Design an enzyme around this catalytic site. Structure first.
Site, mmCIF file in Angstrom:
data_model
loop_
_atom_site.group_PDB
_atom_site.id
_atom_site.type_symbol
_atom_site.label_atom_id
_atom_site.label_comp_id
_atom_site.label_asym_id
_atom_site.label_seq_id
_atom_site.Cartn_x
_atom_site.Cartn_y
_atom_site.Cartn_z
ATOM 1 C CG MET A 191 35.378 -17.180 -9.769
ATOM 2 S SD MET A 191 34.938 -15.441 -9.799
ATOM 3 C CE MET A 191 34.508 -15.181 -8.067
ATOM 4 C CG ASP A 192 40.679 -22.621 -6.395
ATOM 5 O OD1 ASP A 192 41.139 -21.820 -5.547
ATOM 6 O OD2 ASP A 192 40.765 -23.857 -6.279
ATOM 7 N N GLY A 193 42.657 -20.448 -7.735
ATOM 8 C CA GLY A 193 44.051 -20.407 -8.211
ATOM 9 C C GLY A 193 44.722 -19.031 -8.200
ATOM 10 N NE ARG A 227 38.375 -26.033 -7.226
ATOM 11 C CZ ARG A 227 38.209 -26.169 -5.920
ATOM 12 N NH1 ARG A 227 37.093 -26.712 -5.419
ATOM 13 N NH2 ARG A 227 39.163 -25.732 -5.101
#
Ligand SMILES: CC(C)CCOP(=O)(O)OP(=O)(O)O
Ligand SMILES: CC(C)CCOP(=O)(O)OP(=O)(O)O
Ligand SMILES: CC(C)CCOP(=O)(O)OP(=O)(O)O
Ligand SMILES: [Mg+2]
Lengths: 224, 223
Positions: free
Chosen positions: B14-16, B178
């Site tokens: 769960m990136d950004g 991702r």
């Protein structure tokens, strides 16, 4: 291409040799005969660029096949007089006894070489690397040579067959986006690069293109 | 493209979130605040599609390196687990080193797990203070303890046993998604990702939606 931003260790999943031959209408053996010659060329290019290590996936523990096990003997003539230090990782005892000897010969004759270190993963799997390390740790603990308290990341780094420094960049040819049971523990923070180009077609400009792409990426390691 | 035949288990990095906020001239806290509402939305969509398991990476063993202020905000925000998932219909589990989290977070996790354990739909595994190294090490310690107490021999140490000592269990993820554009696994489910198909999207996590999920699933299928 910036010489200062060169990865020190490149991991290579050398996929697409069979498809390369079949799509061309060639015997599948023709695809396999490109494997080591192409790997040697990639070592030559890489060494000029200042790359220190290549770990290359040649045969997984899940992988006709009579041909492959014989072909894998011609490691010796490609590398023995090449300046490359060659190590083989994987389940060596499962191999035909004559391939085992050929591998050992290749390793012994090149161990003094101070150039690029080529690590060939042959009958290798990440699961099996982790499992052999676990077993080694358990035998040591059983013999009173360590405690559960000593079981940490660094210990494990030392018991695995593929050693630190870990790959900075992983290149996989053939178009699929998976690691296929290669260096699982060692790939924890590796940058991945996937290309549709099949391994026999993978040239110097393809290698350079992968490295340039790597250099553009921001590596944060859980921080920043 | 999409065939109505689905992966059982999707893994999600769960990136950004921080970049999402700073692109909008906001404090990073505002990015993080979308984490659980977005995760809950993804569970609803996935459940309608027939996905059985989602394992979502919420906090790594390396994320302790970040600014103390951010780590403090996250550790507080994670207590909203219970309010976010208690009545959601999702069965929630946490993996990771729970003992090193704040005690209030620990009891909040235990309560969320207890209250959702009878839910028969989608199983959400939240990886919080988790890493692949951590998982493999704790498994190894457990095996060593069992060997030293005579509960197993070194000859019993195989893939099948290790699969059962790890925190993230079978079935392993079919697909890893991702967000945030970076092409790495960042010490997530290393053992468990051995044959997983990887889908990397530039879309930042707070912007991730139903179309981005279906695109990932097509790739899995085309295989
Ligand atoms: C050729 C190689 C060892 C890299 C891929 O091996 P593999 O084809 O068995 O992996 P997959 O079946 O998952 O694609
Ligand atoms: C999403 C998560 C909890 C950990 C993975 O994200 P990360 O930003 O820590 O990973 P990187 O530093 O490698 O970019
Ligand atoms: C969920 C989490 C704490 C890590 C993922 O978000 P992030 O903080 O790494 O966001 P950035 O990649 O933009 O830095
Ligand atoms: Mg990030």
């Amino acid at each position: 291409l910036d010489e200062a931003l060169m990865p020190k260790h490149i991991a290579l999943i050398m996929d697409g040799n069979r498809r390369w031959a079949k799509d061309k209408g060639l015997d599948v053996s023709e695809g396999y005969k490109h494997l080591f010659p192409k790997l040697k060329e990639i070592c030559d290019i890489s060494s000029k660029l200042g790359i220190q290590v290549i770990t290359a996936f040649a045969f997984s523990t899940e992988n006709e096949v009579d041909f492959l096990m014989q072909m894998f003997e011609e490691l010796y003539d490609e590398f023995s007089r090449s300046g490359v230090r060659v190590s083989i990782i994987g389940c060596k005892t499962d191999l035909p006894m004559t391939l085992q000897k050929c591998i050992a010969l290749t390793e012994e004759t090149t161990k003094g070489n101070k150039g690029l270190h080529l690590v060939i993963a042959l009958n290798y799997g990440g699961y099996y690397d982790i499992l052999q390390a676990t077993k080694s740790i358990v035998n040591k603990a059983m013999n009173g040579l360590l405690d559960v308290e000593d079981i940490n990341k660094n210990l494990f780094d030392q018991e695995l067959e593929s050693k630190c420094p870990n790959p900075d960049l992983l290149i996989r040819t053939g178009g699929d986006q998976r690691v296929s049971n290669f260096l699982l523990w060692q790939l924890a923070y590796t940058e991945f690069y996937f290309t549709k180009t099949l391994f026999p077609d993978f040239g110097e400009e393809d290698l350079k293109e992968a490295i340039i792409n790597f250099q553009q990426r921001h590596r944060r390691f859980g921080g920043h």
